[PDB]
Design a protein around this ligand. Sequence first.
Ligand SMILES: [Mg+2]
Ligand SMILES: [Mg+2]
Ligand SMILES: [Mg+2]
Ligand SMILES: [Mg+2]
Ligand SMILES: [Mg+2]
Ligand SMILES: [Mg+2]
Ligand SMILES: [Mg+2]
Ligand SMILES: [Mg+2]
Ligand SMILES: [Mg+2]
Ligand SMILES: [Mg+2]
Ligand SMILES: [Mg+2]
Ligand SMILES: [Mg+2]
Ligand SMILES: [Mg+2]
Ligand SMILES: [Mg+2]
Ligand SMILES: [Mg+2]
Ligand SMILES: [Mg+2]
Ligand SMILES: [Mg+2]
Ligand SMILES: [Mg+2]
Ligand SMILES: [Mg+2]
Ligand SMILES: [Mg+2]
Ligand SMILES: [Mg+2]
Ligand SMILES: [Mg+2]
Ligand SMILES: [Mg+2]
Ligand SMILES: [Mg+2]
Ligand SMILES: [Mg+2]
Ligand SMILES: [Mg+2]
Ligand SMILES: [Mg+2]
Ligand SMILES: [Mg+2]
Ligand SMILES: [Mg+2]
Ligand SMILES: [Mg+2]
Ligand SMILES: [Mg+2]
Ligand SMILES: [Mg+2]
Ligand SMILES: [Mg+2]
Ligand SMILES: [Mg+2]
Ligand SMILES: [Mg+2]
Ligand SMILES: [Mg+2]
Ligand SMILES: [Mg+2]
Ligand SMILES: [Mg+2]
Ligand SMILES: [Mg+2]
Ligand SMILES: [Mg+2]
Ligand SMILES: [Mg+2]
Ligand SMILES: [Mg+2]
Ligand SMILES: [Mg+2]
Ligand SMILES: [Mg+2]
Ligand SMILES: [Mg+2]
Ligand SMILES: [Mg+2]
Ligand SMILES: [Mg+2]
Ligand SMILES: [Mg+2]
Ligand SMILES: [Mg+2]
Ligand SMILES: [Mg+2]
Ligand SMILES: [Mg+2]
Ligand SMILES: [Mg+2]
Ligand SMILES: [Mg+2]
Ligand SMILES: [Mg+2]
Ligand SMILES: [Mg+2]
Ligand SMILES: [Mg+2]
Ligand SMILES: [Mg+2]
Ligand SMILES: [Mg+2]
Ligand SMILES: [Mg+2]
Ligand SMILES: [Mg+2]
Ligand SMILES: [Mg+2]
Ligand SMILES: [Mg+2]
Ligand SMILES: [Mg+2]
Ligand SMILES: [Mg+2]
Ligand SMILES: [Mg+2]
Ligand SMILES: [Mg+2]
Ligand SMILES: [Mg+2]
Ligand SMILES: [Mg+2]
Ligand SMILES: [Mg+2]
Ligand SMILES: [Mg+2]
Ligand SMILES: [Mg+2]
Ligand SMILES: [Mg+2]
Ligand SMILES: [Mg+2]
Ligand SMILES: [Mg+2]
Ligand SMILES: [Mg+2]
Ligand SMILES: [Mg+2]
Ligand SMILES: [Mg+2]
Ligand SMILES: [Mg+2]
Ligand SMILES: [Mg+2]
Ligand SMILES: [Mg+2]
Ligand SMILES: [Mg+2]
Ligand SMILES: [Mg+2]
Ligand SMILES: [Mg+2]
Ligand SMILES: [Mg+2]
Ligand SMILES: [Mg+2]
Ligand SMILES: [Mg+2]
Ligand SMILES: [Mg+2]
Ligand SMILES: [Mg+2]
Ligand SMILES: [Mg+2]
Ligand SMILES: [Mg+2]
Ligand SMILES: [Mg+2]
Ligand SMILES: [Mg+2]
Ligand SMILES: [Mg+2]
Ligand SMILES: [Mg+2]
Ligand SMILES: [Mg+2]
Ligand SMILES: [Mg+2]
Ligand SMILES: [Mg+2]
Ligand SMILES: [Mg+2]
Ligand SMILES: [Mg+2]
Ligand SMILES: [Mg+2]
Ligand SMILES: [Mg+2]
Ligand SMILES: [Mg+2]
Lengths: 273, 86
Amino acid sequence: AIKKYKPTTNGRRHMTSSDFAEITTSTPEKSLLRPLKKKAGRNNQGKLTVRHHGGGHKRQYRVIDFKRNKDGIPGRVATIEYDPNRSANIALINYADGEKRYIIAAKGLEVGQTIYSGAEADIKVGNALELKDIPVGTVIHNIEMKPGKGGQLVRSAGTSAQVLGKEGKYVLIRLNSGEVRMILATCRATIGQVGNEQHELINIGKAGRSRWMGKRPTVRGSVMNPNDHPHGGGEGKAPIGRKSPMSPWGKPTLGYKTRKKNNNSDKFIVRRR
Amino acid sequence: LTQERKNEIIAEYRVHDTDTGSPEVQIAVLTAEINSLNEHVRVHKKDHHSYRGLMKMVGHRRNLLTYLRKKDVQRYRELIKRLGLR
RNA sequence: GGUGCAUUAGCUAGUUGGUAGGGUAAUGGCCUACCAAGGCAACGAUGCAUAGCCGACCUGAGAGGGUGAUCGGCCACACUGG
RNA sequence: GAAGACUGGAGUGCAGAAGAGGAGAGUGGAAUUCCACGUGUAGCGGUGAAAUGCGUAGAUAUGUGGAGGAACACCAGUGGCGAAGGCGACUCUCUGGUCUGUAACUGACGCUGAGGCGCGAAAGCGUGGGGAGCAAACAGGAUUAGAUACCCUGGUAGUCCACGCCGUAAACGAUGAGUGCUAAGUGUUAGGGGGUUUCCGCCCCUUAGUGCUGCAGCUAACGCAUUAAGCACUCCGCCUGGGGA
RNA sequence: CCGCCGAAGGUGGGACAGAUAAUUGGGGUGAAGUCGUAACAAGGUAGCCGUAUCGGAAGGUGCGGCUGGAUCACCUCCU
RNA sequence: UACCCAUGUCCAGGAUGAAGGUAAGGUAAUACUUACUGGAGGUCCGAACCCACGCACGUUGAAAAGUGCGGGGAUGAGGUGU
RNA sequence: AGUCGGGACCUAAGCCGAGGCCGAUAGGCGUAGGCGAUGGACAACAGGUAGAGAUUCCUGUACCAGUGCUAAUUGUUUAAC
RNA sequence: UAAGGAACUCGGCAAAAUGACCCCGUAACUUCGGGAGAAGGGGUGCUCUAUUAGGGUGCAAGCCCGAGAGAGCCGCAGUGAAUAGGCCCAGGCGACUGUUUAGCAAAAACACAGGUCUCUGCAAAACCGUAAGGUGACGUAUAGGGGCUGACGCCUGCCCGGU
RNA sequence: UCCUAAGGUAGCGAAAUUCCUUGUCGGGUAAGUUCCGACCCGCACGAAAGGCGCAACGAUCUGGGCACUGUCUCAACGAGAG
Ligand SMILES: [Mg+2]
Ligand SMILES: [Mg+2]
Ligand SMILES: [Mg+2]
Ligand SMILES: [Mg+2]
Ligand SMILES: [Mg+2]
Ligand SMILES: [Mg+2]
Ligand SMILES: [Mg+2]
Ligand SMILES: [Mg+2]
Ligand SMILES: [Mg+2]
Ligand SMILES: [Mg+2]
Ligand SMILES: [Mg+2]
Ligand SMILES: [Mg+2]
Ligand SMILES: [Mg+2]
Ligand SMILES: [Mg+2]
Ligand SMILES: [Mg+2]
Ligand SMILES: [Mg+2]
Ligand SMILES: [Mg+2]
Ligand SMILES: [Mg+2]
Ligand SMILES: [Mg+2]
Ligand SMILES: [Mg+2]
Ligand SMILES: [Mg+2]
Ligand SMILES: [Mg+2]
Ligand SMILES: [Mg+2]
Ligand SMILES: [Mg+2]
Ligand SMILES: [Mg+2]
Ligand SMILES: [Mg+2]
Ligand SMILES: [Mg+2]
Ligand SMILES: [Mg+2]
Ligand SMILES: [Mg+2]
Ligand SMILES: [Mg+2]
Ligand SMILES: [Mg+2]
Ligand SMILES: [Mg+2]
Ligand SMILES: [Mg+2]
Ligand SMILES: [Mg+2]
Ligand SMILES: [Mg+2]
Ligand SMILES: [Mg+2]
Ligand SMILES: [Mg+2]
Ligand SMILES: [Mg+2]
Ligand SMILES: [Mg+2]
Ligand SMILES: [Mg+2]
Ligand SMILES: [Mg+2]
Ligand SMILES: [Mg+2]
Ligand SMILES: [Mg+2]
Ligand SMILES: [Mg+2]
Ligand SMILES: [Mg+2]
Ligand SMILES: [Mg+2]
Ligand SMILES: [Mg+2]
Ligand SMILES: [Mg+2]
Ligand SMILES: [Mg+2]
Ligand SMILES: [Mg+2]
Ligand SMILES: [Mg+2]
Ligand SMILES: [Mg+2]
Ligand SMILES: [Mg+2]
Ligand SMILES: [Mg+2]
Ligand SMILES: [Mg+2]
Ligand SMILES: [Mg+2]
Ligand SMILES: [Mg+2]
Ligand SMILES: [Mg+2]
Ligand SMILES: [Mg+2]
Ligand SMILES: [Mg+2]
Ligand SMILES: [Mg+2]
Ligand SMILES: [Mg+2]
Ligand SMILES: [Mg+2]
Ligand SMILES: [Mg+2]
Ligand SMILES: [Mg+2]
Ligand SMILES: [Mg+2]
Ligand SMILES: [Mg+2]
Ligand SMILES: [Mg+2]
Ligand SMILES: [Mg+2]
Ligand SMILES: [Mg+2]
Ligand SMILES: [Mg+2]
Ligand SMILES: [Mg+2]
Ligand SMILES: [Mg+2]
Ligand SMILES: [Mg+2]
Ligand SMILES: [Mg+2]
Ligand SMILES: [Mg+2]
Ligand SMILES: [Mg+2]
Ligand SMILES: [Mg+2]
Ligand SMILES: [Mg+2]
Ligand SMILES: [Mg+2]
Ligand SMILES: [Mg+2]
Ligand SMILES: [Mg+2]
Ligand SMILES: [Mg+2]
Ligand SMILES: [Mg+2]
Ligand SMILES: [Mg+2]
Ligand SMILES: [Mg+2]
Ligand SMILES: [Mg+2]
Ligand SMILES: [Mg+2]
Ligand SMILES: [Mg+2]
Ligand SMILES: [Mg+2]
Ligand SMILES: [Mg+2]
Ligand SMILES: [Mg+2]
Ligand SMILES: [Mg+2]
Ligand SMILES: [Mg+2]
Ligand SMILES: [Mg+2]
Ligand SMILES: [Mg+2]
Ligand SMILES: [Mg+2]
Ligand SMILES: [Mg+2]
Ligand SMILES: [Mg+2]
Ligand SMILES: [Mg+2]
Ligand SMILES: [Mg+2]
Ligand SMILES: [Mg+2]
């Protein structure tokens, strides 16, 4: 659920958070952990190329299975855990082999269920199938774009895509953004919606809470100097004294479309958002 | 409450092997019904028309309990310890 | 047994009861020490406003409504407090 | 008040019946709109008359296909269900109430009900979706002495969904709830009994609803009249000249 | 002489009641002033009730409801 | 010196009493009330530590930016070493 | 100074980088591999010391790794270790 | 430092004043947490009853902790020294904690949680670099970049001719 | 009636915005160019360069009180370093 906090202080006044009712265990699977090091937006050369990053709580990588290519082995859900590296939760699945791996937790996935992948899998929440074996109208997630590569298209918490038709070698999908797209029929997908739907209702409440997650402050361009930003300067507060609002590097920023005009995938996009 | 399920409760609380309208029998059956609606109302939260029927069972059950208490106290305290009431 | 307000909902701490003593013509938290946390209230506590009470007087077919000067009974007061 | 006894009140049992009563999940067909492609030429749309608007960048019309949302044609009925608000496509799951017959069972276990607790059309409010038609605000065109309107062309919130608020209405039968008594005539909904008849059908009686007409009675009158505004008993709510309000 | 209790007096923060005050808000009264004509007839767009928005003003419009509507057509019940 | 990365370390004492939990009440079950428990916070007062708000002195200074007396933060968007 | 801190032990950020990719020259980037503590592992304690060192020298009692020499034991290619 | 007590001055600047522990009591307003150490008051020393009543520790010896009271005693004064909040009424700006011109400006400036517009279907957009190679991200529209506004409450009107 | 794309809505208003200006009236003071409340003829307010409010917070700015004082009337004496 969503947990409101009592207004004891001025920083806890508007703050809300999840209660983590779905999470089952608090210890990760040791043999599936890899180290991460923060980069703070620093380049290959050490330059700050993407700004407003750096300096949060330290985390550790949990290696996830997006390919889902273990076919014919019944996999049993063991726990549902917390992942700092993504908005959705994850589920630990240990197969009849003895092997264990993490997957994205779908909506309604509970401990004790059995999960299948392949061609003979049933259409149930958690199973992985090729897009040609999925009937029209089902809600899927974790769509992959090239066969054998791994899930990539719908993966954040509460997101879902819907199968929409067939065109021989391709399948129509209505992506979460509202886009209709053509994807090969030999690419896989998982049935269901993605786990943690309430994630968008959280009110951060504090500036320090943004700092905990790795976000440095954002300075507006109107309070800079003329050599710093196309908006800086002027005596007092100044309007946007230009034809259009501008990014820190020129290149208008409001309404100006930035997709390449000679793209090679314009023939696979049926209708844009 | 299905018909055969009701007839087991009746047979389990009869003061003699023939009656079906003793206050002991009616309260036992009424108790079973409100312990079955409470699950329906719990999940079907916005079913207000059915919830009114619940409150007419609770009031009717309370009227019979009050009558039993005045007429014969010893019987009354036997039912509540057996049905788990207050 | 005899008044208005709920657009006045809580009031009380010697307050409620007990044990020992003091004091009074006399019983009593009347007073004191100890012990316990009680007592009153929607059958109207508390608070605000108004008022001496009655026999009786005026009116009324009666039931009631208004009043309490003169006469008689009781009470309180005696420039204002102790 | 106390001790017993009874079954005409009330309730249970047993056998049937009807119903758009409620909540959840899924599905269907007409129709409007938008999109893509054939055919085709100069208007379409609109009004009391017009104009704004759409159309040669090829519309309206027409044939084919796709997407999406909302309401459910005929059945349909002073018909049905619910305490009221209200409930109309189909199927399933979970649930509430009512009517009829029987006389097995308990044996007054009942009625009303200030405070209290719940439900409660539409508009409106908060958060997240959705958005085809309709449409406050708004824009343009007409009408008019003027027209912040009626009329026409567009159109945002809203109307739809989930959760949480709000607590009002000509929320009306302008008629509080319970009980008993007091001429008839005639439709209709759901049952039961009897006579005719092989059935069907016709007739009579009876229970619970739903309409119309009318006697006594009531009413200032209009009118009500076994579904009383008649005759009675119990409990609750409310009123005491108009404005201010 | 000392001690308790103790009227009046002083200090403090609240409670309640009246009067007064620049200005301001709605209300009422005044035959003759200005603007329009919302209601009563189908009152010239039927009216009214709750709500939302807009407009010099009566008021207009949307949503739901009522007849305390003469009305315009096939059927149903009573005489 | 500014920002960042990896790995260590520092913060005397005292005050307040969030969620949750238990028991007793209260209900058809809940809501709700009262006690006990519990130990949250860019919470509170205040040293070390960090900072630099006022005044005075210094101004060929003890010092090419300091000292004295008061002042702000002091479990965090914290200080600091390699 | 076998025992304390550091090498002959280990790795983080970072740095270098055979082949390799890129680029007027110079060179830039990067795989295997390797360096790199501020972290991980690892065997010694108490006294004495009158000019200057002490877990180091001296006294007493220890521990860690290894080597040879003796004495029994066991095993020998269905095979101790 | 007598008497006065802001008459000084741009301005109560500076100084003076309050200050510990225990008890009583406490307003408007409120986002119901606060305001609050609001305000305003009262008590503190020593002796005797007294190794107290009662607690911690121990097998006991013993040791440690120490409230209420009564009676007294002494000073001008009892937290007798040092250390230890002055408070109230009303308005402007910023919601709050935080950051800023090393060396004249600490603020009403910046940041912030929140709002909204817009770009991006993944070899994502955006950014560094001639390129290779990278950040974004070991992420995937509930995610990432940019512009403006800045908790919360009530609201956000008209104009698409010009750019 | 002329012009325009359209002619500023709610709210606020001598304001961190008002030249004239110490606007005019009221309060506070014995006396108030500053302060608070009203008015509206807004040189030259106005809705995300957001409009109007707002409990808690502030080494922020502004006006008024209690206490207190060598700040002052008006200065005097004493200690230490020059
Ligand atoms: Mg950013
Ligand atoms: Mg910003
Ligand atoms: Mg600047
Ligand atoms: Mg420039
Ligand atoms: Mg500029
Ligand atoms: Mg500027
Ligand atoms: Mg300016
Ligand atoms: Mg009396
Ligand atoms: Mg006695
Ligand atoms: Mg007494
Ligand atoms: Mg009284
Ligand atoms: Mg009379
Ligand atoms: Mg009389
Ligand atoms: Mg006299
Ligand atoms: Mg006199
Ligand atoms: Mg019966
Ligand atoms: Mg149904
Ligand atoms: Mg239904
Ligand atoms: Mg169709
Ligand atoms: Mg004409
Ligand atoms: Mg067509
Ligand atoms: Mg009914
Ligand atoms: Mg049922
Ligand atoms: Mg049913
Ligand atoms: Mg019926
Ligand atoms: Mg019998
Ligand atoms: Mg009732
Ligand atoms: Mg009531
Ligand atoms: Mg609605
Ligand atoms: Mg809404
Ligand atoms: Mg919405
Ligand atoms: Mg018009
Ligand atoms: Mg239209
Ligand atoms: Mg609702
Ligand atoms: Mg009203
Ligand atoms: Mg009403
Ligand atoms: Mg109705
Ligand atoms: Mg009425
Ligand atoms: Mg009646
Ligand atoms: Mg009747
Ligand atoms: Mg009938
Ligand atoms: Mg009157
Ligand atoms: Mg009156
Ligand atoms: Mg008219
Ligand atoms: Mg209009
Ligand atoms: Mg209507
Ligand atoms: Mg009429
Ligand atoms: Mg770091
Ligand atoms: Mg703090
Ligand atoms: Mg502070
Ligand atoms: Mg600094
Ligand atoms: Mg300090
Ligand atoms: Mg502090
Ligand atoms: Mg040695
Ligand atoms: Mg060594
Ligand atoms: Mg070492
Ligand atoms: Mg090379
Ligand atoms: Mg290199
Ligand atoms: Mg390496
Ligand atoms: Mg090394
Ligand atoms: Mg080291
Ligand atoms: Mg060692
Ligand atoms: Mg030495
Ligand atoms: Mg030594
Ligand atoms: Mg003096
Ligand atoms: Mg003096
Ligand atoms: Mg004085
Ligand atoms: Mg003064
Ligand atoms: Mg002067
Ligand atoms: Mg001055
Ligand atoms: Mg000062
Ligand atoms: Mg003792
Ligand atoms: Mg002292
Ligand atoms: Mg002090
Ligand atoms: Mg600030
Ligand atoms: Mg400076
Ligand atoms: Mg790239
Ligand atoms: Mg590249
Ligand atoms: Mg990368
Ligand atoms: Mg969304
Ligand atoms: Mg805001
Ligand atoms: Mg700003
Ligand atoms: Mg807000
Ligand atoms: Mg605007
Ligand atoms: Mg334009
Ligand atoms: Mg244009
Ligand atoms: Mg002035
Ligand atoms: Mg001012
Ligand atoms: Mg004046
Ligand atoms: Mg001044
Ligand atoms: Mg002054
Ligand atoms: Mg003023
Ligand atoms: Mg202006
Ligand atoms: Mg402005
Ligand atoms: Mg603007
Ligand atoms: Mg602002
Ligand atoms: Mg303001
Ligand atoms: Mg303000
Ligand atoms: Mg601060
Ligand atoms: Mg001041
Ligand atoms: Mg001297
Ligand atoms: Mg000297």
